[PDB]
């Protein structure tokens, strides 16, 4: 996934608060998340891909092998089972917890990196540009 | 309540979607409500006060006597018991339904009419100016 490597900064967000609402994130956390304009850092070392999100309030980091299910603790503190695959040039992530699931797709669009999150019909789109 | 009589147009909104979230309003309805910039019309005839809200998508109207509980069907279709009193120069409304309650205060602030809605700690503020 060479096309994803680098540091990216958030440029725009659409329906993010609504997505967090469906996921079950609390008011305060949603408020903190909404003011945060995180920087996404993606790097690859061998068959391990690392995705790091940095914000003044909270940094998250996941390292994984494409196709292998792993444990992830989300920024809003959910302990989920995640699996990320490379499909059609996009990184497709599915998170499962308590009988529920959500999909997060990271894809290239022109010179931007677009992240789409889907939870029960509600879709959020966040656009990033290289920092 | 002579100070409230007239037609008012929405000028600004703060945390309205979050308030609707706490009240239990669905995604689609919240989306329609968020694009609506309603006009509030207040009039008094004898001891009956009428508050009418007009929008391209939905008009609501309630007529009541201050201090007497009455039935109200909200824009989001909840059938509630409402009671409105005049306290400290402000119209204070309490809506009760299914063991829950929310308070809506309509007050004058300078030349504006301010509406504050509170639901479980979440507070929304909407400012109106004369049309
Ligand atoms: C108290 C600190 C709060 C920090 C933010 C917390 C956010 C909690 C909700 C996270 C939902 C999942 C986000 C997936 C990546 C979206 S994207 O950002 O990668 O595009
Ligand atoms: C499909 C049509 C949708 C129309 C809008 C529906 C809104 C539903 C939620 C209403 C919550 C209560 C609003 C109190 C007055 C707020 S204020 O507006 O008077 O300031």
Task: Describe the structure in your own words.
Chains A, B: The modification Phosphoserine is found at residue 12. Chains A, B: It is found in: Cytoplasm; Nucleus. Chains A, B: Lipid transport protein in adipocytes. Binds both long chain fatty acids and retinoic acid. Delivers long-chain fatty acids and retinoic acid to their cognate receptors in the nucleus. Chains A, B: This is Fatty acid-binding protein, adipocyte. The structure is a homodimer of 131-residue chains. The first copy, chain A, is mainly beta and 131 residues long. Chain A has a single domain (1-131), classed as Beta Barrel (Lipocalin), CATH 2.40.128.20. The first copy, chain A, has two helices and ten strands. Chain A has helices at residues 16-23, 27-35, and strands at residues 6-14, 39-45, 48-54, 60-64, 70-73, 79-87, 90-97, 100-109, 112-119, 122-130. Chain A has a ten-stranded antiparallel beta sheet. At the A-B interface, α1 of A face α1 of B. The structure holds 1-hexadecanosulfonic acid (HDS) (2 copies).
